[PDB]
Amino acid sequence: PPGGGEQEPPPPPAPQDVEMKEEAATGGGSTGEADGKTAAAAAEHSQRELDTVTLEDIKEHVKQLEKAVSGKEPRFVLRALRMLPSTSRRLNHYVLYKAVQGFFTSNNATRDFLLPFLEEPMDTEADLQFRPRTGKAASTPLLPEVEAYLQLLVVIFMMNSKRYKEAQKISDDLMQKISTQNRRALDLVAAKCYYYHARVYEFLDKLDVVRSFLHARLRTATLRHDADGQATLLNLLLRNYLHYSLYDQAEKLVSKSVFPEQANNNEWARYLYYTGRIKAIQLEYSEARRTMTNALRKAPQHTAVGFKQTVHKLLIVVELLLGEIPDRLQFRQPSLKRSLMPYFLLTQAVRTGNLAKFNQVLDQFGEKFQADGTYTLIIRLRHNVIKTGVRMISLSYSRISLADIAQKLQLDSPEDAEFIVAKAIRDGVIEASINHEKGYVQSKEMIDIYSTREPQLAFHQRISFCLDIHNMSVKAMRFPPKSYNKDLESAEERREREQQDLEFAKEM
Amino acid sequence: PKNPDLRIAQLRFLLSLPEHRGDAAVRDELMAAVRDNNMAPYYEALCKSLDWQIDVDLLNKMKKANEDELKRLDEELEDAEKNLGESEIRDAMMAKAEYLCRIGDKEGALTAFRKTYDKTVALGHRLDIVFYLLRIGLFYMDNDLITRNTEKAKSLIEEGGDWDRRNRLKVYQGLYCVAIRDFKQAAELFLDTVSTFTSYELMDYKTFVTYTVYVSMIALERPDLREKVIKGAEILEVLHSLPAVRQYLFSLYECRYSVFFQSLAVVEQEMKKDWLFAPHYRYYVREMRIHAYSQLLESYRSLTLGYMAEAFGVGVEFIDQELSRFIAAGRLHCKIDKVNEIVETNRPDSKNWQYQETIKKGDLLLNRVQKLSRVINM
């Protein structure tokens, strides 16, 4: 009680001190400046909403004695929030419950009391037409319930709060979404509640109804308004279809919603990765290595362990499927001591020309490759290890026996070592002849690839592209032309005085 | 003082990285550590060391002796300012702030050095302060802070000639260019070996001779080797005291191929044990191999593969697997035959290989400017 009575009373007012300045500013700005004014010219409450997600992702941890969050819900749920003469008392009501926390004892919300903290779209003239107020005032209690999750009998409280937010969401889908950003502002709130929705209501229970309801939410997109419903409703569509085995990869090929037109650098950046693993499981033919690479390069700056360690793995999985491999051990910051050793230990065997060294990897870490689930892509690398081998030996040796290459490749059979070489001439790779009667495989010395018309194509790929980045440095450039206020010619008074001086020169 | 201060860090290397060899290094490193007032740089070296449980009074007598030098500075700063000389506060700790640089960490060094940098109006003190910042910039491997005071250093030598401040400086840029894997610049900073002196950091001049020959044997070709390191009287007589390095250098020059690997295991093994070559002993000899291979192999065309075992180095299958990874590695310009048992060569005109580095640098700078172009303007 001294240690609690001196360290517990300061964490109610200072979070109140900052939350009367951030999302009470969003309460005064996104309710009165998005529901009633234009927010397309000023949409800063979406990035402020990003701030009031990322702060509260790591703001709350404890079970909240001293009612430091447990007393916020009997405060923050009694909100009319209609107009300034009705919220002028509410600005006092941000203070009148501080006396309830400090002077008295409030309702300690500990896994049981979330029921009287949700049945307020009715208490004291509350509504639902102001869905910038009722979706933000839905999410503002819908987040901190589910931010720590509390999987002990809170799933139904979170569930019923999601049902009230589904009443706000059906009102969003049906009722008066024209020119108010009612749909646009709550596609971000809808999008962000799809992940708490999708981390209580996905892997516990029954996602396949959120499939049909999500195709209804995708159905109400693309007709009325062409933004914010084309973007999140496709990765949020994809994220368990990649974990499923339905045909929804070719539907994503023939989809019109593949471009949601500058999807905010966060869903768009990961979207290219999620469609990168699509052609991974459907046989990368070097098509999606640029979209995996682009999916890597459009990342922000937070951490790497969630997705970036897996695009740093899968991005050159698909190049190990090609035959090229960059070194992965680069900016050793968190990812290159923790999450490489089985997987760089994989490509160490691929960059060699050994056959069962690959097996010495794949018995050592077959289960770690099944921990993420890339194992069905790892299993087919023996083809590219042996094409690496036949390119290595066909490039190194010139007149080499077939009765040597099987033993050096520990193939244990020369009789198909004629045949791996045979398909190595079939598929392209190595060209020259085999003396099957003698045994030696001859290979010609092919030099002066210079005159052969490959490096003109290596030019021509990058000529037009460097002109493209020149053109982007031209087109992303003429917006700071602005405020060019007045190019005055000379003057008026000095021009009349110059005419008077020329008049004196004409009189003289 | 910072003049024996490189041997300290080299013996920290001798403590940490040889795992079995960590007993006499923590004996003599303590023999230097818990005297001469050293306080800060060995707490984590004590963590890598054993417990050494009662070090408390050992730290107390030396933070006390450190407090003595601190408080006599605190007895100097007010007498210095009463009747002022050339800012005698910063004239006292412009000399004792290097004592604070060794004893304290880099902070009481740096604020006093950038402090006293504005005091002396000539570079005769400034450039030595900057030499001190360079030397601690090696110590904490301050790879960004060395880039500043190298240019800020070199900006002072142009007025005057200052060859004890330029040729001495070239030793610092040479040790940086061999700290990084920049060998052709390391030997080029090690070009003179005449004005280079019986140093503090290489107290043997002959160790500097070994370093410049070990980098020069990669760094230059035969013309430079058949004029430069073979006709220098200043370079011959100092390896006249060396039996090994004289044989290790001349065996490549006298085409003594089989004995070259013998001293190659010696010099490479010493390079494995050595500080500052331990980052690149693995990269050194794999250059030495392909150099010694290409030198012999660009003489003949019809030279067989079972000739090099008895005349060059034993193990025919060892030569097989060693050349296969080099032709397959994309260098060592030849083409080996197998079952008629002969090694063929070719010759590439500088039209493809000179082009390969062009597409490398083009892809590098295209990655650079495209990455920056994605960064700026969102």
Binding site: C466, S473, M477, P480 | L366, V369
Partner: peptide, 30 residues
């Protein structure tokens, strides 16, 4: 390929010469 590689960098330097005319002008004048 060389001169084509130089030109885009030239216009990038010209872009930064315009962003310096954007951000240090909009706060000053308004």
């Amino acid at each position: 390929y060389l001169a084509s590689l130089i030109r885009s960098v030239v216009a990038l330097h010209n872009l930064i010469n315009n962003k310096i005319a954007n951000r240090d002008a909009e706060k000053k004048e308004g």
